[PDB]
Amino acid sequence: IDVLLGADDGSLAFVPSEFSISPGEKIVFKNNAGFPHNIVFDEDSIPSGVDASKISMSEEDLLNAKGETFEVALSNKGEYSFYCSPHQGAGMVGKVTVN
Ligand SMILES: [Cu+2]
C-alpha cells in the first residue's frame, strides 16, 4: 500500500492516514509535498511487545527528497499509531490496523 507524505494540494497529511493491512503487507511511505517528513510509530500506541525501532524512523531521521520512501511491513496484529515528527501538531498523523 502506498502512502503519500504530504497531499497533492500541499496539505501536511498522510494519504491515506487510516488504513488496514494484513501481516507482512508492504507499506511504502513516499515523499510527495511539504518534505522533509518522517514516519514514527508511537512506542506507547503499538501492539504488545513490538519493537518500535524495527518499524519506525527515528524522530531525527528525515526523508529529504521528493519520491524518497520509507518501506515497512508490519507483522503483529493490532492498531499502530504513527506521526510525522516535525508536522505532528499540524495534524500529520495516522493509524494502521493489522488484522
Ligand atoms: Cu511531515
From Swiss-Prot:
> What does UniProt list as this organism's lineage?
Eukaryota, Viridiplantae, Streptophyta, Embryophyta, Tracheophyta
Which is a Gene Ontology cellular component entry for this protein? chloroplast thylakoid membrane
Q: Which gene encodes it?
A: PETE
Q: Which residues bind Cu cation?
A: H37, C84, H87, M92
From the Swiss-Prot or TrEMBL record, give the protein name: Plastocyanin A, chloroplastic
Q: Cofactor stoichiometry and binding?
A: The crystal structure with reduced Cu(1+) has also been determined.
Q: What is this protein for, i.e. what is its function? A: Participates in electron transfer between P700 and the cytochrome b6-f complex in photosystem I.
Which cofactor does the UniProt annotation name?
A: Cu(2+)
- Shown part of the complete sequence: 70 to 168 of 168
Q: List the disulfide bonds.
A: none
Record membrane topology: Peripheral membrane protein
Which family does the entry's similarity section mention?
Belongs to the plastocyanin family.
UniProt domain Plastocyanin-like: residue ranges:
1-99
An example Gene Ontology molecular-function term = electron transporter, transferring electrons from cytochrome b6/f complex of photosystem II activity
Q: Which UniProt keywords apply?
A: Chloroplast, Copper, Electron transport, Membrane, Metal-binding, Plastid, Thylakoid, Transit peptide, Transport
Its subcellular locations are: Plastid, Chloroplast thylakoid membrane
